[PDB]
């Protein structure tokens, strides 16, 4: 779906791609319990190598939003990834 | 004879049901009851043979020998195993379990029903494998100059009715036509986790796959002429039924300390 | 003539599509069956002039015709053990000759069993109750599964093995269903022994009960045999529980009317050994210049499992060394290797 | 007898010549499928198997209102027009459920409970005896009760006993199996549980030992397991959302209430709250007298005698007493009992109910 | 099967597998759910290393986030000698 969801992107630009919730998926465990919840870790992941894929352009803009903040993480990190933090 | 004629799908035949009638099982899942040429008998047909059977028509032509196997699904048969037991050292209680469990009843069938106690007819090897283990198993395989059929058991897991369940039929008795043979079954857990604990998921589509490993496996065995070895990472996560006295006799452990 | 004829006839037969395998569903009164098909879908079909509903029933297996729709032949039904795991043995071959040391349980076995389902009219007629479940607890796979098997083979009835966790399914009362289904078919299976399996081990049975669904199934069994002292006030089959901890166990559950009666399984003596090693080696060639009381004087910490172990492993160095005839050297060095096993941890 | 005669002559006609184009219709091979939904242009969708799905007009053998939502029923091979409706196939999936009618037991047999047997038949009982007593005076009498003691010492027995009177279906509910590990799993089986029982009334429903789907915590949702509190819900929305006046009627068993949310027993619907007594030695002889009615004994047994060495147990083991003493008969090869069966039998259990850790005294 | 037999013909090739952990986990709570799925994959892997298809001018590389669902037999030589990490 992420996959599409960025190949209509690029072909869309000038775009926001607003995502709703960043914790629904952005769990992903950190035990052996990711096993189970691969799915949330997976799609997650695919954004980022993807974001991170391509830099020095601002085709697609892909914008996040949590109801309340409990994910952070040192993946999220790069510039052509989750470059931006506001509060 | 003549009528019928190719191009033609392949069946597996089922069972007689009678002079000149047969329940067939076609390989895409789908079973069908049929008639069968009064050129091919009752002694010229097994429930577990290959037959040839019409495409539209559907009764049976001719007959054909076992030799099909998958390779999307990915079934190998293995001539040429040319590893031995100096390819690997230092695991000597575990060389003497396997050699007495693996090739004496192949070997020397008549000893046992001689002495007229039971032979083993299943291992079980546990334990993490390609430590050296898998070695043993091709190298006795290579020795005995019994043929290596390596068998993925996780690629059987197959997500309907159609391939998987077929491909377990043809396995062993394809097997037990170019005996001797080793059939070594890597990780069997897949087609073998299911309740324990009331927390394991999904199992069904699996189901009907333990049952026909269940038929083939007491099915032979009995003229000790093919053997069977199980191998899987843990051993926690099998059913009884394949662990039972009768057909699991053997429990070699991969040794620790 | 007739030889040139019947050619000609399988001729002409042979240009049929064929039919379909297909399960019947439910028998209907309106000369019609509910099949489902295995290659197609589910069809209703109004079967064939030659026959009545009366003359099939439901769960047959058949052959339906794909050009007419009748059943042109029913072959079997769908056999007993079935869903995740379940074992159905028809005919027991356990017997008290197959075990031995069994003098302490055979009084005990034959009156909380067998007296009661072999004469109903003797229960009745002292006024007696027929007891609701009976728990055996001993020392693990010994032979108490065995045991359980012998008296089946007796009392004459299928000994049914339920594995508690496989009556575990992930879906909406489908397990629920399992679970109702299975005192269905021991109730039209009657007399039956049903054996609750997994709350013992042999040692190839995983799972001795645990804190999820083997106690709980355990409580369901309780449940029914009260019922059927109720309604219908027959009850003719019987729930043998096994287990090897107290801590499956609740006082409730010991309550008389829920388990009657609690029998405790053999523990291992010197002399028991001898008679089980006796009966299994009077199968196989062993020496007559053996002497079953060194043997079993030798085994100290071994059940009835391990007295198998030992004649096993005994016949594999004979016929590693070639012969077909034990003796006592290689039953006393069988026996030292079994021993070392019961020393770890 | 002249009345079907003069009705026979026309109708015989007419329903040939009926049966006859019904036949042309029906005519093999038809598919099963299941109705999806009824649209209000008065079409409706069905969901074929074999993967055709159309909104067709129905043919007659059943009427639009006759048939529902997710219905089982007949379809046509070309066009799936839904000719007429079947009944579900390929194994309906229902939950554990245990079915008695009129289950063996009055409190004849059990008296002695005489104080909770009033209790139980005013509430349950009387209600069930008067159905459109119910529908007339509206109001709600008890719907449900609670019985709290221990299982087949009366708590069993009594909603055995009541549901023989009424001719009630008695529904036999194992807690437990509600306790499957995943979910939306336990919530959809409970509503599967009242669904059947509202269908089929009248019904006593009896829920067997709730405390393992239950535990109150101090919350009403918590860090712990998820499934036993989602269970524990829908129970609770269950009683305090659909009321009945005498159709469907409660009976809710656990051992001890106090495990229990005070907004799971709702006054309102549970008004009835039946604890258990002690036997006093005048009860002793009673429950003893019915249960020896059905043996066959020796004269030199004395029911006072054995009564009074009795001393603080209750009915169980005086029912564990008569099987007991009749074993060491039936051992004797005798269908009589004597005097001494039962003097072993009375001692043996009372040693063993009768454990002593000095908690009593003071 | 088909992504190394073609590494083999087309050699050298590196097989660049994100997340195996999702197709080389080993549980944690021994469910089955896709999770057979996660077997059949695994299985696939070890078969072609421990056979006598031939890896050594054909080039594996596995990246998984935290090491806690690979086997012992992963471990051994052969299959994964090198194990680089990051600080």
Same mark, same amino acid.
């Given at each position: 779906?992420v996959?599409?969801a960025f190949?209509?992107?690029?072909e869309?630009?000038?775009?926001?791609?607003?995502?709703?919730?960043?914790?629904?998926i =952005?769990t992903?465990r950190?035990?052996?319990?990711?096993? =189970?919840?691969?799915?949330?870790?997976?799609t997650?992941l695919?954004?980022?190598?993807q974001?991170?894929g391509?830099?020095?352009?601002?085709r697609?803009?892909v914008?996040?939003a949590?109801?309340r903040?409990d994910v952070l993480?040192?993946?999220?990190?790069?510039? =052509?990834?989750?470059?931006?933090?506001?509060? | 004879?003549?009528?019928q004629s190719?191009?033609?799908?392949?069946?597996q035949?089922?069972?007689?049901?009678?002079?000149?009638?047969?329940?067939v099982?076609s390989?895409?899942?789908?079973?069908?009851?049929?008639?069968?040429?009064?050129?091919?008998?009752?002694?010229?047909?097994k429930?577990?043979?290959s037959?040839?059977?019409h495409?539209?028509?559907?009764?049976?032509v001719?007959?054909?020998?076992p030799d099909?196997d998958?390779?999307?699904?990915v079934?190998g048969?293995?001539?040429?195993?040319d590893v031995?037991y100096?390819?690997?050292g230092?695991?000597?209680?575990?060389?003497?379990?396997?050699r007495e469990?693996?090739?004496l009843?192949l070997?020397?069938?008549?000893l046992?029903?001689q002495?007229?106690i039971?032979?083993p007819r299943?291992?079980?090897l546990y334990?993490?494998p390609?430590?050296g283990?898998?070695?043993?198993?091709?190298?006795?395989?290579?020795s005995t100059?019994?043929a290596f059929?390596r068998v993925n058991?996780?690629?059987f897991?197959?997500?309907?009715?159609?391939?998987?369940?077929?491909?377990?039929?043809?396995?062993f008795?394809?097997?037990?036509e170019?005996?001797?043979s080793?059939?070594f079954?890597?990780?069997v857990?897949?087609?073998?986790?299911?309740?324990?604990?009331a927390?394991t998921?999904?199992?069904?589509?699996?189901q009907?796959?333990l049952?026909?490993l269940?038929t083939?496996?007491?099915?032979?065995?009995?003229?000790?002429?093919?053997?069977v070895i199980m191998?899987?990472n843990?051993?926690?996560?099998?059913?009884?039924?394949?662990l039972?006295?009768?057909?699991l006799?053997?429990?070699?452990?991969?040794?620790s300390? | 003539?007739?030889?040139?004829?019947?050619?000609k006839d399988?001729?002409?037969?042979? $240009?049929?599509?064929g039919?379909?395998?297909?399960?019947?569903?439910?028998?209907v009164?309106?000369?019609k069956?509910?099949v489902?098909?295995?290659p197609?879908?589910k069809?209703?079909?109004?079967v064939a002039?030659?026959i009545?509903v009366k003359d099939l029933k439901?769960?047959?297996?058949?052959?339906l015709?794909?050009?007419?729709y009748?059943?042109?032949?029913?072959?079997?039904?769908?056999?007993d053990?079935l869903?995740?795991?379940?074992?159905?043995?028809?005919?027991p071959?356990?017997?008290?000759?197959?075990?031995?040391?069994?003098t302490?349980? &055979?009084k005990?076995?034959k009156?909380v069993?067998?007296?009661?389902?072999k004469?109903?009219?003797?229960f009745?007629?002292l006024?007696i109750?027929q007891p609701k479940?009976?728990?055996?607890?001993?020392?693990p796979?010994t032979?108490?599964?065995?045991?359980?098997?012998?008296?089946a083979?007796?009392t004459?009835?299928?000994? &049914?093995?339920?594995?508690?966790a496989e009556?575990? $399914?992930?879906?909406?009362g489908?397990?629920?269903?399992?679970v109702?289904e299975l005192?269905?078919?021991?109730?039209?299976?009657?007399?039956?022994?049903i054996?609750?399996?997994e709350?013992?081990?042999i040692?190839?049975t995983?799972v001795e009960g645990?804190?999820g669904?083997?106690?709980?199934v355990?409580?369901?069994?309780?449940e029914?045999?009260? @019922?059927?002292?109720?309604?219908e006030?027959s009850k003719?089959?019987?729930?043998?529980?096994?287990?090897?901890?107290?801590?499956?166990?609740?006082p409730?559950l010991?309550?008389?009317?829920?388990?009657?009666?609690?029998?405790?399984?053999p523990?291992?003596?010197?002399?028991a050994?001898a008679? &089980?090693?006796?009966?299994?080696?009077?199968?196989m060639?062993?020496?007559r210049? &053996?002497?079953?009381?060194?043997?079993?004087?030798?085994?100290?910490?071994?059940?009835?499992?391990?007295?198998?172990?030992?004649?096993?492993?005994?016949?594999?160095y004979?016929?590693?060394?070639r012969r077909?005839?034990?003796t @006592?050297?290689?039953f006393?060095?069988?026996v030292?290797?079994?021993?070392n096993?019961? @020393?770890?941890? | 007898?002249?009345?079907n005669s003069?009705?026979?002559k026309?109708?015989?006609?007419?329903?040939?010549?009926?049966?006859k184009?019904?036949?042309?219709? #029906?005519g *093999?091979?038809?598919?099963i499928g299941?109705?999806e939904?009824?649209?209000?242009?008065?079409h409706?969708?069905?969901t074929?198997?074999?993967?055709?799905?159309y909104?067709?007009?129905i043919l007659?053998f059943?009427?639009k209102?006759l048939?529902?939502?997710?219905?089982?029923?007949?379809l046509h091979?070309?066009?799936?027009?839904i000719?007429g409706?079947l009944?579900?196939?390929?194994?309906?999936?229902?939950?554990?459920?245990?079915?008695?009618?009129s289950?063996?037991?009055?409190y004849?047999?059990?008296?002695?409970?005489?104080?909770?047997?009033?209790?139980?038949?005013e509430?349950?009982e009387?209600?069930?005896?008067?159905?459109?007593?119910?529908?007339?005076?509206?109001?709600?009498?008890?719907?449900?009760?609670?019985l709290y003691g221990?299982?087949?010492?009366?708590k069993?027995?009594?909603?055995?006993?009541?549901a023989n009177?009424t001719?009630a279906?008695?529904?036999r509910?194992?807690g437990?199996?509600?306790?499957q590990?995943?979910?939306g799993?336990?919530?959809?089986?409970?509503?599967?549980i009242?669904?059947?029982?509202?269908?089929?009334?009248?019904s006593?429903?009896?829920?067997?030992?709730?405390?393992?789907?239950?535990?109150?915590?101090?919350?009403? *949702?918590?860090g712990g397991?998820?499934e036993?509190?989602?269970?524990?819900?829908e129970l609770?929305?269950?009683?305090?959302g659909?009321d009945?006046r005498?159709?469907?009627?409660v009976?809710m068993?656990?051992n001890?209430?106090?495990?229990?949310?005070?907004?799971?027993?709702?006054?309102?619907?549970?008004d009835?709250?039946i604890?258990?007594?002690?036997?006093?030695?005048?009860?002793?002889k009673?429950?003893?007298?019915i249960?020896?009615?059905?043996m066959?004994?020796?004269?030199?047994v004395?029911?006072?005698?054995l009564?009074?060495?009795?001393?603080?147990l209750?009915g169980?083991?005086?029912?564990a007493?008569?099987?007991e003493?009749?074993?060491?008969?039936?051992?004797?090869? #005798?269908?009589?009992?004597?005097?001494?069966?039962f003097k072993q039998?009375?001692?043996r259990?009372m040693? *063993?109910?009768?454990?002593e *850790?000095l908690?009593?005294?003071? | 099967?088909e992504m190394?037999?073609y590494?083999?013909?087309?050699?050298p090739? /590196?097989i660049?597998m994100?997340?195996?952990?999702?197709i080389?986990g080993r549980?944690?709570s021994?469910?089955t759910?896709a999770?057979?799925? /996660?077997?059949?994959?695994?299985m696939?892997l070890?078969?072609?290393?421990?056979?006598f298809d031939n890896?050594?001018?054909?080039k594996i590389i596995?990246?998984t986030?935290?090491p806690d669902?690979?086997?012992?037999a992963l471990?051994?030589?052969?299959?994964?000698?090198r194990?680089v990490? /990051?600080?």
């Amino acid at each position: 779906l992420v996959r599409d969801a960025f190949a209509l992107a690029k072909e869309k630009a000038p775009t926001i791609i607003f995502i709703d919730e960043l914790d629904a998926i =952005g769990t992903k465990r950190f035990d052996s319990e990711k096993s =189970g919840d691969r799915e949330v870790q997976r799609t997650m992941l695919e954004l980022l190598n993807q974001l991170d894929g391509f830099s020095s352009d601002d085709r697609v803009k892909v914008l996040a939003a949590t109801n309340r903040v409990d994910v952070l993480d040192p993946a999220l990190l790069r510039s =052509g990834r989750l470059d931006r933090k506001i509060e | 004879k003549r009528i019928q004629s190719v191009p033609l799908v392949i069946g597996q035949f089922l069972e007689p049901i009678d002079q000149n009638t047969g329940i067939v099982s076609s390989t895409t899942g789908m079973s069908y009851v049929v008639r069968i040429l009064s050129t091919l008998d009752r002694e010229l047909l097994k429930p577990s043979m290959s037959v040839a059977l019409h495409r539209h028509s559907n009764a049976l032509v001719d007959i054909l020998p076992p030799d099909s196997d998958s390779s999307i699904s990915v079934m190998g048969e293995n001539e040429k195993p040319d590893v031995t037991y100096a390819d690997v050292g230092g695991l000597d209680m575990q060389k003497q379990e396997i050699r007495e469990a693996v090739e004496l009843p192949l070997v020397q069938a008549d000893l046992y029903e001689q002495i007229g106690i039971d032979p083993p007819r299943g291992v079980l090897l546990y334990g993490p494998p390609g430590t050296g283990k898998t070695m043993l198993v091709k190298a006795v395989a290579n020795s005995t100059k019994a043929a290596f059929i390596r068998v993925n058991g996780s690629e059987f897991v197959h997500k309907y009715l159609g391939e998987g369940p077929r491909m377990v039929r043809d396995v062993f008795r394809l097997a037990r036509e170019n005996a001797p043979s080793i059939i070594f079954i890597d990780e069997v857990d897949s087609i073998a986790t299911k309740r324990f604990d009331a927390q394991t998921g999904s199992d069904r589509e699996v189901q009907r796959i333990l049952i026909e490993l269940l038929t083939q496996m007491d099915g032979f065995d009995q003229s000790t002429n093919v053997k069977v070895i199980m191998a899987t990472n843990r051993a926690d996560t099998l059913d009884p039924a394949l662990l039972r006295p009768g057909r699991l006799d053997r429990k070699i452990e991969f040794p620790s300390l | 003539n007739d030889k040139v004829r019947f050619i000609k006839d399988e001729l002409r037969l042979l $240009q049929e599509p064929g039919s379909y395998v297909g399960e019947v569903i439910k028998i209907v009164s309106d000369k019609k069956v509910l099949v489902k098909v295995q290659p197609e879908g589910k069809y209703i079909v109004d079967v064939a002039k030659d026959i009545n509903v009366k003359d099939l029933k439901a769960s047959q297996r058949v052959c339906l015709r794909s050009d007419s729709y009748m059943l042109h032949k029913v072959l079997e039904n769908k056999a007993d053990p079935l869903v995740s795991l379940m074992m159905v043995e028809k005919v027991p071959d356990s017997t008290y000759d197959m075990v031995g040391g069994l003098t302490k349980q &055979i009084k005990e076995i034959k009156e909380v069993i067998e007296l009661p389902v072999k004469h109903p009219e003797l229960f009745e007629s002292l006024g007696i109750a027929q007891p609701k479940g009976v728990i055996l607890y001993g020392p693990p796979g010994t032979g108490k599964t065995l045991l359980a098997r012998a008296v089946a083979h007796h009392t004459d009835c299928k000994f &049914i093995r339920v594995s508690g966790a496989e009556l575990v $399914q992930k879906y909406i009362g489908e397990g629920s269903r399992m679970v109702r289904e299975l005192f269905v078919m021991a109730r039209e299976h009657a007399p039956s022994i049903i054996f609750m399996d997994e709350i013992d081990s042999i040692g190839s049975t995983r799972v001795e009960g645990s804190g999820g669904g083997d106690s709980e199934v355990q409580r369901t069994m309780l449940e029914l045999l009260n @019922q059927l002292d109720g309604f219908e006030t027959s009850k003719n089959i019987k729930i043998i529980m096994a287990t090897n901890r107290l801590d499956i166990l609740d006082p409730a559950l010991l309550r008389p009317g829920r388990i009657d009666r609690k029998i405790e399984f053999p523990p291992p003596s010197v002399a028991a050994r001898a008679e &089980i090693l006796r009966i299994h080696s009077r199968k196989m060639n062993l020496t007559r210049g &053996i002497n079953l009381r060194k043997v079993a004087e030798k085994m100290n910490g071994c059940s009835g499992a391990d007295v198998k172990g030992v004649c096993t492993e005994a016949g594999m160095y004979a016929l590693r060394e070639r012969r077909i005839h034990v003796t @006592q050297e290689d039953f006393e060095l069988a026996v030292g290797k079994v021993m070392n096993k019961n @020393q770890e941890t | 007898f002249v009345s079907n005669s003069e009705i026979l002559k026309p109708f015989e006609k007419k329903q040939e010549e009926e049966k006859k184009q019904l036949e042309e219709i #029906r005519g *093999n091979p038809l598919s099963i499928g299941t109705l999806e939904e009824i649209i209000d242009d008065d079409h409706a969708i069905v969901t074929s198997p074999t993967m055709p799905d159309y909104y067709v007009s129905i043919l007659s053998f059943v009427d639009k209102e006759l048939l529902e939502p997710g219905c089982s029923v007949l379809l046509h091979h070309k066009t799936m027009s839904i000719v007429g409706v079947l009944q579900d196939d390929a194994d309906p999936m229902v939950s554990v459920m245990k079915m008695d009618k009129s289950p063996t037991e009055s409190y004849s047999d059990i008296g002695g409970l005489e104080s909770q047997i009033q209790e139980i038949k005013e509430s349950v009982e009387l209600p069930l005896t008067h159905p459109e007593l119910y529908e007339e005076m509206g109001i709600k009498p008890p719907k449900g009760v609670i019985l709290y003691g221990a299982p087949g010492t009366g708590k069993t027995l009594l909603a055995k006993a009541v549901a023989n009177q009424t001719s009630a279906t008695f529904l036999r509910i194992v807690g437990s199996e509600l306790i499957q590990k995943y979910l939306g799993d336990g919530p959809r089986l409970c509503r599967q549980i009242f669904k059947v029982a509202g269908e089929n009334a009248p019904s006593i429903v009896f829920i067997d030992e709730i405390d393992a789907i239950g535990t109150k915590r101090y919350d009403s *949702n918590s860090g712990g397991e998820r499934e036993i509190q989602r269970t524990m819900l829908e129970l609770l929305n269950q009683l305090d959302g659909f009321d009945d006046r005498g159709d469907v009627k409660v009976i809710m068993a656990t051992n001890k209430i106090e495990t229990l949310d005070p907004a799971l027993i709702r006054p309102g619907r549970i008004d009835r709250k039946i604890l258990f007594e002690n036997p006093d030695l005048s009860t002793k002889k009673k429950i003893l007298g019915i249960h020896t009615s059905k043996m066959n004994l020796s004269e030199d047994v004395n029911l006072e005698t054995l009564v009074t060495t009795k001393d603080d147990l209750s009915g169980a083991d005086i029912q564990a007493m008569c099987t007991e003493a009749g074993l060491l008969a039936l051992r004797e090869r #005798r269908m009589q009992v004597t005097a001494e069966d039962f003097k072993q039998a009375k001692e043996r259990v009372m040693k *063993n109910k009768v454990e002593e *850790n000095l908690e009593g005294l003071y | 099967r088909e992504m190394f037999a073609y590494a083999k013909e087309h050699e050298p090739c /590196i097989i660049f597998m994100d997340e195996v952990d999702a197709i080389g986990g080993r549980r944690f709570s021994e469910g089955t759910s896709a999770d057979r799925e /996660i077997q059949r994959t695994l299985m696939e892997l070890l078969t072609q290393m421990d056979g006598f298809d031939n890896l050594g001018q054909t080039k594996i590389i596995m990246a998984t986030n935290r090491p806690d669902t690979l086997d012992p037999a992963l471990l051994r030589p052969g299959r994964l000698d090198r194990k680089v990490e /990051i600080p």
